[PDB]
């Protein structure tokens, strides 16, 4: 059992998202004229949970969009994690120009997925600003990107992988770190 | 005289660049296989100064590239600062793929110029990472960008402008803050 450790149990996930929701409301005037955009399949589901939490706290709906991204690599190396983002498409159901957008990512690692998400946003509109909310920050950035909202920060080596499980995809809520 | 204040005199500029040069060498194995790329006219001149400082400390030359960017705005508002970057072109004289690149900016403000600089880099190659060095960070980010190396951090309001003067452009070395 010693090559996996739980870094967020289901309670901690709920608590972290609830805290992020409150931080969004405090920093962004109750989230009027602010849109959440998920990246990664699990980032999308997290953005939808966050929108529902903000609606319950504030009483007004929050719009959610999605950016569909797959990460590839240029070589045959299985150890190194996928680090070249391909934007498959995007669906943001309202105009973002002059609005605040918050990108929602499950795990902040190299920053490359975020960079492609910002590019996809500025391709469809001219938001007044883009912020970044992440469930876990595991360090090892390869770009000059930082999150505005963080569920939990953990130290990691490059030999490790962080796995997020969500009910919607995986039929359970958990975050764990694994040795590769 | 009370609508301008000097935040870096010529001594402080020299000292800040010398400190950034040492920090680059400590963090990046003496800057072998690391390229500096300036953005903004003054960011280019700063990158060339930094390269010369690293050469003097380490003894090996450092390659400098340039990205040519002009900032525009979509409206007639003179108060708000220019916030839409147009990449006019780039000249990076070596391949950047699998190399470390450091972008050099004079003043970090919204982050939008940096975002266009990263995009221009990933359009011509696949660097192993991109870092960011700035002479001054004046806050008020509009994107989730942070510098890796900072000469000086200052608090500012949106009513203020930061002016960098360099010998190469302005015939003097100074940084000041002004009330708009």
Tokens of A30: 């109750």
Under a CB-based contact definition with an 8 Å cutoff, are residues B138 and B154 in contact? yes
Under a CB-based contact definition with an 8 Å cutoff, are residues A143 and A160 in contact? no
Chain-centroid distance of CA B110 in Å reads 13
Q: Which of B114, B128, B142 sits opposite A129 (nearest CB)?
A: B142
Binding residues of B for substrate: 41-42, 105-113, 138, 162
Tokens of B100: 């470390």
A positions 19-38 inside 8 Å of B (CB) = none
Name residues whose C-beta falls within 8 Å of residue B39's C-beta, 6 or more positions apart in sequence. Answer: B66, B67, B69, B103, B104, B105, B113, B114, B116, B117
Tokens of A72: 């590839």
A145–B142: do the CB atoms touch at under 8 Å? no
- b/e per residue B59-83 (b: at least 16 CB within 10 A): eeebbbbbbbbebeeeeeeeeeeeb
Under a CB-based contact definition with an 8 Å cutoff, are residues A124 and A140 in contact? no
B144–A128: do the CB atoms touch at under 8 Å? no
**B142 in A contact zone (CB under 8 Å):** yes
Compute the distance between CA of residue B79 and CA of residue B75 in angstroms, rounded to an integer.
11
Name residues whose C-beta falls within 8 Å of residue A77's C-beta, 6 or more positions apart in sequence. Answer: none
CA nearest A50: which of A10, A99, A93, A105? A105
Residue boundaries of the structural domains of chain B: 1-180
| Structure letter (DSSP) for residue A158 | T
Resolution in A: 1.3
A144–B130: do the CB atoms touch at under 8 Å? yes
CA B105 → CA A18, A171, B83, B108, distances in Å?
Answer: 37, 46, 15, 7
CA nearest B132: which of A115, A23, A15, A76? A115
- b/e per residue A104-140 (b: at least 16 CB within 10 A): bbbbbbbbbbbbbbbbbbbeeeebebbbbbbbbbbeb
A114–B143: do the CB atoms touch at under 8 Å? no
Write down the experimental method used for this entry: X-ray
Binding residues of B: 41-42, 105-113, 138, 162
H or E stretch covering B8: strand B4-8
Q: Hey, how many other C-beta atoms are within 10 angstroms of the C-beta on B167? A: 11
Q: Which residue has the tokens 């900032």?
A: B71
Fold for domain A1-180? Rossmann fold (3.40.50)
A130–B146: do the CB atoms touch at under 8 Å? no
B122–A115: do the CB atoms touch at under 8 Å? yes
B142–A128: do the CB atoms touch at under 8 Å? yes
**A73 in B contact zone (CB under 8 Å):** no
What value does the CA radius of gyration of chain A take, rounded to a whole number of Å?
16
Binding residues of A for substrate: 41-42, 105-113, 138, 162
Under DSSP, is residue B42 helix (H, G, I), strand (E, B) or coil?
A: helix
Tokens of B124: 């011509």
How far is the alpha carbon of A144 from chain B, nearest alpha carbon, in Å?
A: 5
What is the number of alpha carbons within 13 Å of residue A180 lying toward its C-beta? 14
**B84 in A contact zone (CB under 8 Å):** yes
């Amino acid at each position: 059992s010693n090559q996996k450790a739980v870094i967020l149990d289901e309670q901690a996930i709920r608590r972290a998202l609830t805290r992020i929701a409150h931080e969004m409301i405090e920093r962004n005037k109750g989230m009027n004229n602010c849109i959440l955009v998920g990246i990664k399949t699990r980032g999308i589901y997290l953005a939808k949970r966050l929108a529902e939490r903000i609606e319950q706290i504030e009483g007004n709906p929050v719009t959610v969009g999605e950016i569909d991204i797959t990460l590839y690599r240029d070589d045959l190396s299985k150890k190194t994690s996928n680090d070249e983002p391909l934007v498959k498409g995007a669906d943001i159901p309202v105009d973002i120009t002059d609005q605040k957008v918050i990108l929602v990512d499950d795990v902040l690692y190299t920053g490359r997925t975020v960079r492609a998400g910002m590019d996809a946003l500025v391709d469809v509109g001219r938001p007044s600003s883009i912020q970044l909310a992440v469930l876990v920050d595991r360090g090892h950035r390869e770009l000059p990107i930082r999150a505005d909202y963080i569920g939990k920060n953990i130290p990691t080596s490059k030999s490790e992988k962080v796995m997020v499980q969500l009910d919607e995809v995986d039929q359970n809520d958990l975050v764990a770190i694994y040795e590769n």
